[PDB]
Amino acid sequence: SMKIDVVTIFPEYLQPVRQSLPGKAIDAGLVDVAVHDLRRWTHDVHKSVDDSPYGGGPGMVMKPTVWGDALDEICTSETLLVVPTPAGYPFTQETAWQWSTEDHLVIACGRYEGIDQRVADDAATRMRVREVSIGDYVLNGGEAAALVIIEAVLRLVPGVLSLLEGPSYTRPPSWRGMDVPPVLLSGDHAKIAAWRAEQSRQRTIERRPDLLGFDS
């Protein structure tokens, strides 16, 4: 039984949560996901969540006042506050396993430019805070990163049921003149294991040499 709160200025964008793995998890009552519009915690008539950065630079920074009020209401001392950001620690499969046993995740989604640093500083006096990057590409905002984190974590939650995977095949055994590798049809568990290992080796060394401790 896990609770996930997502805070965003684009709550309708978190709707893809409702299908696939996360939707089934919610429907089965293993997790509850609640999405909050950040502007709920604004008090000016224009619902302003951002302002220009001190020191200059392009873009805007999300205001600490609004985030502070939001997180005051949503978070407790047991909360794990997740802040997706291009400047975060890497989010890995190990991170996913670690967070899969948490009672309460709060995910704060900002734009790329980011949230005033003092929000995370202030929250860390009260709760555990993790700023993480899902990758070294650039998104407009944290919302898509939130969906990725949620999907990676939820599939590891109890109750929701190295080397690259090599190629996989299914019926029919010949298709457009391309045959499935005969060893896979042979029913020889040993030779199949050997073949799959060799395929995975070739693929990892070609596509992800870093996984085996090589350059690039």
Ligand X SMILES: Nc1ccc2nccnc2c1
Q: Which residues are annotated as a binding site for S-adenosyl-L-homocysteine?
A: 84, 110, 133-135, 137, 139
Assigned token pair, 71: 């997180």
Give whole-number Cα distances, 18 to 25, 42, 108, 207, in Å: 9, 27, 19, 33
We find the least distance from the C-beta atom of residue 28 to ligand X, in angstroms, to be 21
- Near its own copies by CB under 8 A: residue from 3, 47, 50, 104: 50
- The listed partner (ligand X, its own copies, none) that binds 142, CB under 5 to 8 Å by sort, is ligand X
Q: Which of 154, 132, 33 is nearest to 82 (CA)?
A: 132
205, amino acid identity: I
Q: Is residue 127 a contact point for its own copies (CB under 8 A)?
A: no
- Near ligand X by CB under 6 A: residue from 25, 61, 145, 184: 145
Contact assessment for residue 71 and residue 107, using Cβ atoms and an 8 Å cutoff? no
Distance (Å, whole) CA 92 – CA 90: 6
- Near ligand X by CB under 6 A: residue from 16, 53, 68, 141: 141
- Near its own copies by CB under 8 A: residue from 40, 140, 194, 212: 140
Q: Which of residues 58-87 bind its own copies (CB under 8 A)?
A: 60-65, 68, 86-87
